[PDB]
Design a protein around this ligand. Structure first.
Ligand code: ZN
Lengths: 196, 1111, 52, 98, 175
């Protein structure tokens, strides 16, 4: 009774009604969060949620056809059970039964897989990202330096500090405008190092 | 010796070798020609018995045939595979982007039983990819290596565990097949004997015995010795075979109503029939060997038997009772003991022929499914084998094995050692073996049954340590897949010259001596007691007549890359592991000299790797050029050998081949006729010999950094050639066809200067980062131009230019000379994919000097980047005036326990300067065991200290004390190996002597020009709008969780916020930051990152009502 | 390097707010009594039925 | 509360969406398992990538090209039903399956 | 019939109609028979002659018969990186084109501002530099009270003024 009263008191003390645990409509995520991109060479790549959504729509439309056709309850109940399993595979694939697989016996990636784990949203894209203005090389020892100094290779510094040097090339009248200043930085003219 | 023109490398070794090193690609070539059924394999198998052997393809076709439908009225069976000649040779296949293959023809045969009719054809089965002469496959133009897999063999595996509540020994069995259903037999904490048949719950074994059809009198008569079996017979409360079958059927297939015939045939059609259960020939062999069932009978009928099940339960109850021997009625006695699953007599090797055989078997199962399926539809007496057979699944199975599999890998081509060590690799992971994260710490260990079979040293140091290993030098592989190793048979204390190849079980049965125990010149042991290796990894001292085998050599336990480390037994095993793994990352240099002090392995590892051109038949060299050698044989005929000049390897390096024979020279068969990438006069040469000093020097070699001379940059000592290949193709679009042209949209005639009159660069032209290589243009269509752009077009008179420039340009940070262009076309009937009309490849080669940031190593695990390249004049120099070439730090040597590098430095100085032992008043006492004519050497002598039998420290002391002067009588390095140096800057002499000598260092493929990247703004991802990652893009660096915790610990709220919004995700803030930097203003305030909005839409689409509130 | 396009266009304009074309609002009603507003152009023929 | 997300948030509340919430977030019902045309590679009406539901693919154009500037901003084409606006609203509009 | 027509409608993500699925299956059977009875993969000319179509129609059908790959599959072997982390968004704002267009707008407004008032107004209303709507010469003529040919003549003379080096040197770099 204690373990039951946790969820009964949760539905009581709030303004929630427990009727929201059964679905009468299913929301559909916006298209560019599950895109269909056309690669180089005319090949297409798509996003594994279109297959799960298409299974839901196919079984729902066929159920509408059977109900308005007046089919027997064996056929209608088999269609309803299939519709239920397709919505379950959309929300959480492989939680109940065998996962729905794509080509090559690879299970499809459902809506709860976008959130969980080391490679989910929360840990891959929100708590740590990839950043602009950012380089990497291999360190060697700098025993002539002071403690507050580092040696930065000039070819890395020219790419990190590129807008600052474009602004300064325009300001010193080495370039007429930002387009020719960007061309000077890309072609590595001799004025670029004096500015850098 | 035994190689016809080898250079004279005098050896410090003291022991005679009874057995020569085998072919080091036998593990690949013998397996694949078993799979074919070659006449060479047929006679090699006929040597080891007349056992009527069958190849891998014939074995698959025999186990498949005959395919019969359900009525039994018709059958289709296969026979007699044959191969034609290969369609095109290996160089043509590599050049033209093809696959080196041969067509396979089998003989199919159809029988109509009701009438009697034999309709026999000859069916094309596909283009089977063939293995070249070096153990590789040319799959789609690239050279690939299939890696052998270490797996657990099928069989019976008894083991025990100790309980921790009752402290009882709980024994168990698992019998595991290839392709079947499992069954176990536990003995639990109560006195019961269980069965988990096919991973079900549990039941007593008397249920299974009664279901097989045993009465309780039969069970009591058999297991009359066991109180466990009597108790579990009494406590089962189920009597009768039909009742037991009902009890099994009620849980084996739950939900199906128990019918009598289905219940009676469930057990037989689950285990005892060849459809759904066949432990293989190896599994049947191991079951018969463990339980002692059939001793000399040929292995056939590889399903399980009721005698096997009863023998397993009898073995289990006798093992729990505590006996040590048993006999089943009708067999031989066997010891009763538990099994180790990591033991190399239980771990087999699925080699290249067996992995390809499994994929052929998988494809032919789908083929015979379609055979039955279209055998039922079509009208009988109108059908024929070419109407029944669909070979497309077999073709696709072999194709998707050779491309996109884990064990079909891109061949490691840095040097010949990388290539030779990629073959002879035993990887424990892959499809059918264990994972990397789910693998325990017990399978990553070195076991005493790896002696002579797997190398304990050479393994990766990453997260694969122990799961990938290498074959030892002398090891063989069984017909069944077990690794053998050779031993010398000793009888009555006399070591004979019989060589017996023992697998790990027979080695456990005998007692095996050591290869350096003394011998009284006929074979008889000198000492009274000999050090041996006993059954469980025990090392004892037994009497000299207790011994019955002996190792053929020291270094029997090591692999090829480990047997090239001189003074290995003075290095710790961590540093030896690093040295062996860095030896196959060295790059080919432009000149490539051979080491002064080496082992003897460098010649055979260079001939066996295959980058050396070897004269196939003796003759006389008729004409040499840089492109070919033509030798005229002893009977009229000649043969020309083309060289591979300046060819790109799989990893970017160069693959030059240089002749080393003169124009009238007589060559012998097997003599090296042309060099290779990393060889000098035929032997493997991965580095250079440099003069070293072992001092610290002003902090520039602090913590593994390295100081180099500028002589190594001026004289091109450590300089290498790297080739890059860039590819574009011009295919059909929806709006038209792309074309390759000089008439590109609006770019100047400055940047169209090196392009010939079809839009490709000229050969020989220097290219910089951003230069046009192939000028391509695509049809664009119609778009709406801005009013500003339309006004500019109206001012300057330019047109719309309905095509869009997408050329191929040199990427960032690259340059070189264009050295080769390879253009394929659709109209010239080249085989291009569908859509592609033209394909162009450009080769850009550049020559790289050594620069700081580059990584060097020696053979003893001593790596380090270059920190400084000093001038020649400020380098420590000898009293001769000779500068040193490399300075290595002292503090890195003794805490790493790799003084093999110091003893190598000492021997290298003695081999550079030469020596002479003064045998005037007799040979000195330290040189009593020195081989003769190691008693003097000339300057720059090449010497060889083998691995566990080499130069001792007494011999290095003596050779340091006698060594030749330079040009004046000036012995520069004293009897300790230490020299007096001068400072190149101050001029004063350094106050104490410094260790100098010649160490053989090599340059590793971890260069700075590949490692450096930077980014200000570049490509962004698609769903979340964060930067892409990688040097191949522009690519951002990752700022993860641990970096965020460091920023929060500092307190840097503004730095952290700017990194996580307007440098990743804030799509409207990125552009305003750029505009504000360029206009010189203040950086604006951040906004909501786009990943948070993507998170909110995914939470909403999981039916959760997430909403942001105001106050 | 893979490079793909979700097949759409991005225009470079200043999003203004003042000089915009006139619009008229229709109102539709479905068979369960719901009501919706659709902004059509002023110089355009309002359809009889609309999928809401 | 806020929906455009200008960064004055006080709270983020989670709850359990009912069917009225779902069909109030939605911009239209998707009722075909179609994605794009196989020939013209443009989205299909009522499909999973529909422009009448999810917004236009090109900045400030309708589907039939009848309205094509920022002068027509915020109106709905009377032929195809596509509201002429930005193309980045296809990351923000949801639909539903009944 | 119901099973086969449903499979044609519902097998693929990008839906090919039933008649095109029928010619794709026909080409597949033809190609299998020729590969079996020829010992070699047949050419498009041999396929197009066996199936009575043109050799470009064979390639159109063979390129309509291609199924999409998945954005969510692991393209690595050990790094656990998907495919979608390798595809550059080729339609994002490039952040230097967007500021170059801004500075082009400012510079073009300056060069037009150093002309006369009506001469600059003619070019701005002609090219729609103020509201994105390029008007015609008669509209600008009734705006300024002038006729169409005089509007065209002063437009030609302002183009002659703007084609000068002293005006166009500051704008040559923006193409
Ligand atoms: Zn429209």
């Amino acid at each position: 009774a204690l373990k039951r009263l946790k969820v009964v008191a949760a539905f009581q003390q709030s303004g929630n009604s427990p009727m929201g645990m059964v679905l009468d409509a299913v929301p559909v995520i916006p298209p560019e969060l599950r895109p269909m991109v056309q690669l180089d060479g005319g090949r297409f790549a798509t996003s594994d949620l279109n297959d799960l959504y298409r299974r839901v729509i196919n079984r729902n439309n066929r159920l509408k056809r059977l109900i308005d056709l007046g089919a027997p309850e064996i056929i209608v109940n088999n269609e309803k059970r299939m519709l239920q399993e397709s919505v379950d595979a959309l929300f959480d694939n492989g939680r109940r039964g065998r996962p729905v697989t794509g080509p090559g016996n690879r299970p499809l990636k459902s809506l709860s897989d976008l959130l969980k784990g080391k490679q989910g949203r929360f840990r891959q894209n929100l708590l740590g990202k990839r950043v602009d203005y950012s380089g990497r090389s291999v360190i060697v020892v700098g025993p002539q330096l002071k403690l507050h100094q580092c040696g930065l290779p000039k070819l890395m510094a020219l790419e990190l500090f590129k807008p600052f040097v474009m602004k300064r090339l325009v300001d010193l009248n080495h370039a007429q405008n930002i387009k020719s200043a960007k061309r000077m930085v890309e072609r590595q003219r001799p004025q670029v190092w004096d500015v850098l | 010796n035994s190689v016809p023109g080898a250079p004279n490398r005098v050896s410090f070794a003291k022991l005679r070798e009874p057995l020569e090193v085998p072919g080091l690609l036998d593990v690949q070539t013998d397996s694949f020609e078993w799979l074919i059924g070659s006449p060479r394999w047929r006679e090699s198998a006929a040597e080891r018995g007349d056992v009527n052997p069958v190849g891998g393809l014939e074995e698959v076709l025999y186990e498949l045939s005959p395919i019969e439908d359900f009525s039994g009225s018709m059958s289709l069976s296969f026979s007699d595979p044959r191969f034609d000649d290969v369609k095109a040779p290996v160089d043509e296949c590599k050049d033209k982007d093809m696959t080196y293959a041969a067509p396979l023809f089998v003989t199919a045969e159809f029988i109509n039983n009701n009438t009697g009719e034999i309709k026999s054809q000859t069916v094309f089965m596909g283009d089977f990819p063939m293995m070249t002469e070096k153990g590789t496959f040319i799959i789609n133009g690239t050279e690939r290596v299939v890696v052998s897999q270490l797996v657990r063999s099928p069989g019976v595996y008894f083991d025990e565990t100790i309980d921790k509540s009752t402290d009882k020994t709980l024994h168990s069995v698992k019998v595991i097949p290839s392709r079947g259903a499992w069954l176990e037999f536990d003995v639990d904490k109560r006195d019961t004997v269980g069965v988990r048949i096919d991973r079900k719950r549990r039941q007593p074994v008397t249920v299974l015995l009664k279901a097989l059809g045993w009465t309780s009198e039969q069970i009591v008569e058999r297991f009359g010795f066991s109180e466990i079996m009597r108790s579990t017979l009494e406590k089962d409360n189920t009597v009768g075979t039909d009742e037991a079958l009902l009890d099994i059927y009620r849980k084996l297939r739950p939900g199906e109503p128990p019918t009598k015939e289905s219940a009676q045939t469930l057990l037989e059609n689950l285990f005892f029939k060849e459809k759904r259960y066949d432990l293989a020939r190896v599994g049947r062999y191991k079951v018969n060997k463990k339980l002692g069932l059939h001793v000399g009978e040929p292995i056939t009928s590889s399903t399980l038997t009721e005698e096997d099940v009863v023998a397993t339960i009898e073995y289990l109850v006798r093992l729990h009772e505590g006996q040590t021997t048993m006999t089943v009625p009708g067999g031989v006695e066997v010891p009763v003991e538990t099994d180790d699953i990591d033991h190399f007599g239980n771990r087999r090797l699925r080699t290249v022929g067996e992995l390809i055989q499994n994929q052929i078997r998988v494809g032919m199962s789908r083929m015979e499914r379609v055979v039955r399926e279209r055998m039922t539809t079509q009208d009988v007496e109108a059908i024929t084998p070419q109407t029944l057979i669909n070979i497309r699944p077999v073709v696709a199975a072999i194709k998707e094995f050779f491309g996109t599999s884990q064990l079909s890998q891109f061949m490691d081509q840095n040097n010949p050692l990388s290539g030779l060590t990629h073959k002879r690799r035993l990887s424990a992971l892959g499809p059918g073996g264990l994972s990397r994260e789910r693998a325990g710490l017990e399978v990553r260990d070195v076991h005493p049954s790896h002696y002579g079979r797997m190398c304990p040293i050479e393994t990766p140091e990453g997260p694969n340590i122990g799961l990938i290993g290498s074959l030892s030098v002398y090891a063989r592989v069984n017909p069944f897949g077990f690794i053998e190793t050779p031993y010398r048979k000793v009888v009555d204390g006399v070591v004979s010259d019989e060589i017996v190849y023992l697998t790990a079980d027979e080695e456990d049965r005998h007692v095996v001596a050591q290869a350096n125990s003394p011998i009284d010149a006929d074979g008889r042991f000198v000492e009274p007691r000999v050090l041996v290796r006993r059954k469980a990894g025990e090392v004892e001292y037994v009497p000299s007549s207790e011994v019955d085998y002996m190792d053929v050599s020291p270094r029997q336990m090591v692999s090829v890359a480990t047997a090239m480390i001189p003074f290995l037994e003075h290095d710790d095993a961590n540093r030896a592991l690093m040295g062996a793994n860095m030896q196959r990352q060295a790059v080919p240099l432009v000149r490539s000299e051979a080491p002064l002090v080496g082992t003897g392995m460098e010649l055979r590892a260079a001939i066996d790797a295959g980058d050396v051109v070897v004269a196939e038949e003796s003759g006389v060299i008729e004409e040499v050029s840089a492109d070919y050698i033509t030798v005229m044989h002893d009977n009229g005929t000649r043969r020309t050998y083309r060289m591979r000049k300046f060819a790109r390897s799989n990893h970017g390096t160069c693959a030059n081949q240089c002749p080393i024979v003169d124009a009238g020279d007589r060559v012998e068969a097997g003599q090296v006729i042309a060099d290779g990438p990393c060889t000098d006069d035929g032997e493997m040469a991965l580095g250079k010999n440099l003069l070293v000093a072992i001092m610290p020097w002003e902090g520039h070699n602090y913590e593994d950094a390295i100081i180099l001379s500028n002589r190594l940059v001026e004289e091109d000592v450590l300089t290498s050639i790297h080739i890059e290949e860039h590819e574009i193709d011009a295919r059909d679009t929806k709006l038209g066809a792309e074309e390759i042209t000089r008439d590109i949209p609006n770019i100047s005639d400055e940047v169209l200067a090196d392009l010939d009159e079809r839009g490709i660069v000229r050969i020989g032209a220097e290219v910089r980062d951003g230069d046009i290589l192939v000028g391509k243009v695509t049809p664009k269509g119609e778009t709406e131009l801005t009013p500003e752009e339309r006004l500019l077009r109206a001012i300057f008179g330019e047109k719309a230019r309905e095509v869009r420039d997408t050329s191929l340009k040199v990427p960032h940070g690259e340059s070189g000379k264009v050295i080769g262009i390879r253009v394929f076309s659709r109209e010239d009937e080249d085989e291009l994919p569908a859509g592609v009309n033209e394909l162009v490849r450009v080769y850009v080669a550049q020559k790289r000097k050594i620069s700081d940031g580059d990584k060097l190593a020696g053979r003893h695990g001593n790596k380090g980047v270059i920190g400084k390249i000093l001038p020649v004049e400020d380098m420590p120099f000898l009293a001769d005036g000779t500068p040193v070439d490399i300075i290595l730090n002292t503090h890195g040597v003794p805490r790493r326990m790799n003084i093999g590098q110091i003893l190598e430095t000492h021997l290298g100085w003695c081999a550079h300067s030469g020596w002479k032992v003064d045998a005037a008043k007799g040979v000195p006492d330290w040189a009593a065991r020195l081989p003769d004519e190691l008693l003097e050497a000339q300057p720059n002598a090449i010497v060889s200290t083998p691995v566990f039998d080499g130069a001792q420290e007494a011999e290095l002391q003596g050779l340091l004390s006698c060594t030749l002067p330079n040009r004046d009588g000036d012995v520069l390095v004293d009897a300790d190996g230490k020299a007096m140096l001068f400072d190149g800057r101050s001029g004063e002499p350094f106050p104490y002597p410094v260790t100098v000598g010649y160490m053989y260092i090599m340059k590793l493929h971890h260069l700075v020009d590949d490692k450096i990247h930077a980014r200000s703004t570049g490509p962004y991802s698609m769903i979340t709008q964060q930067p892409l990652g990688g040097k191949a893009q522009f690519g951002g660096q990752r700022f993860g969780e641990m970096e965020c915790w460091a920023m929060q610990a500092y307190g840097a709220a503004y730095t952290l916020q700017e990194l996580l919004t307007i440098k990743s995700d804030d799509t409207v803030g990125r552009v305003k930051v750029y505009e504000a930097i360029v206009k010189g203003e203040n950086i604006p305030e951040p906004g909501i990152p786009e990943s948070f909005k993507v998170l909110l839409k995914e939470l909403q689409s999981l039916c959760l009502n997430v909403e942001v509130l105001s106050s | 390097v893979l490079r793909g396009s979700r097949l759409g266009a991005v225009s470079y304009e200043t999003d203004r707010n003042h000089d915009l074309a006139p619009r008229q609002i229709a109102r539709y009603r479905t068979d369960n009594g719901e009501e919706f507003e659709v902004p059509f152009a002023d110089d355009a023929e309002i359809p009889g039925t609309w999928l809401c | 509360g806020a929906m455009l997300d200008v960064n004055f948030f006080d709270e983020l509340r989670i709850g359990l969406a009912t069917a009225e919430d779902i069909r109030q977030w939605s911009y239209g019902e998707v009722k075909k398992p179609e994605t794009i045309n196989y020939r013209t590679l443009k989205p299909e009406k009522d499909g999973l990538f529909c422009e009448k539901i999810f917004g236009p693919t090109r900045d400030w154009e309708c589907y039939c090209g009848k309205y094509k500037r920022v002068r027509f901003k915020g109106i709905i084409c009377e032929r195809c039903g596509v509201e002429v606006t930005r193309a980045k609203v296809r990351r923000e509009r949801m639909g539903h399956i009944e | 019939q119901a099973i086969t027509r449903a499979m044609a409608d519902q097998a693929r993500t990008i839906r090919i109609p039933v008649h095109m699925v029928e010619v794709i299956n026909k080409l597949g059977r033809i190609q299998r028979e020729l590969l079996q009875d020829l010992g070699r993969e047949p050419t498009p000319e041999e396929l197009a002659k066996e199936m009575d179509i043109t050799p470009e129609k064979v390639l159109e059908i063979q390129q309509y018969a291609r199924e999409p790959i998945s954005l969510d599959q692991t393209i690595g072997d050990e790094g656990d990186s998907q495919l979608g982390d390798f595809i550059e968004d080729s339609e994002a704002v490039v952040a230097v084109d967007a500021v170059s267009f801004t500075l082009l707008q400012d510079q073009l407004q300056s060069v037009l501002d150093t002309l006369s008032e009506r001469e600059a107004g003619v070019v701005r209303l002609r090219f729609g530099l103020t509201d994105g709507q390029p008007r015609t010469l008669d509209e600008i003529g009734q705006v300024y009270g002038v006729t169409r040919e005089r509007i065209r003549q002063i437009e030609s003379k302002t183009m002659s003024k703007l084609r000068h080096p002293s005006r166009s040197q500051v704008l040559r770099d923006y193409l």
